[PDB]
Design a protein around this nucleic acid. Structure first.
Length: 90
RNA sequence: GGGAUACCAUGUUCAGAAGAACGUGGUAUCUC
């Protein structure tokens, strides 16, 4: 895999629905002696789908995405939620 | 000689299912 296109898609194409809040948070302020940074993949609900770290951070970005789609159970979990979700959170 | 993160500003591209991310250059610290 290792394909962003695929990732980003899996996100706002396989799960990312209306009123999801899905969002990534950058953590580990890069350094000029180890730029490497990490990414947190979670949702406003306080749920982290996964994570991703890299030396040129990007790997971290794309890695984070692939991480979100790296949870078949989590993914499918939202699939059902999507069907349920009564025009709101609960 | 090469290489990288980031601030300030703006835009393109990735893909080609779907929709998102990265880049362009100005300055700088560090590093090989």
């Amino acid at each position: 895999g290792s394909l962003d296109m695929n990732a980003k898609r899996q996100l706002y194409s396989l799960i990312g629905y209306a009123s999801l809040r899905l969002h990534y948070v950058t953590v580990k302020k890069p350094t000029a002696v180890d730029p490497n940074s990490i990414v947190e993949c979670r949702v406003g609900d306080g749920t982290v789908l996964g994570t991703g770290v890299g030396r040129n951070i990007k790997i971290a970005g794309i890695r984070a995405a692939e991480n979100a789609l790296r949870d078949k159970k989590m993914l499918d979990f939202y699939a059902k939620q999507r069907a349920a979700i009564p025009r709101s959170e609960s």
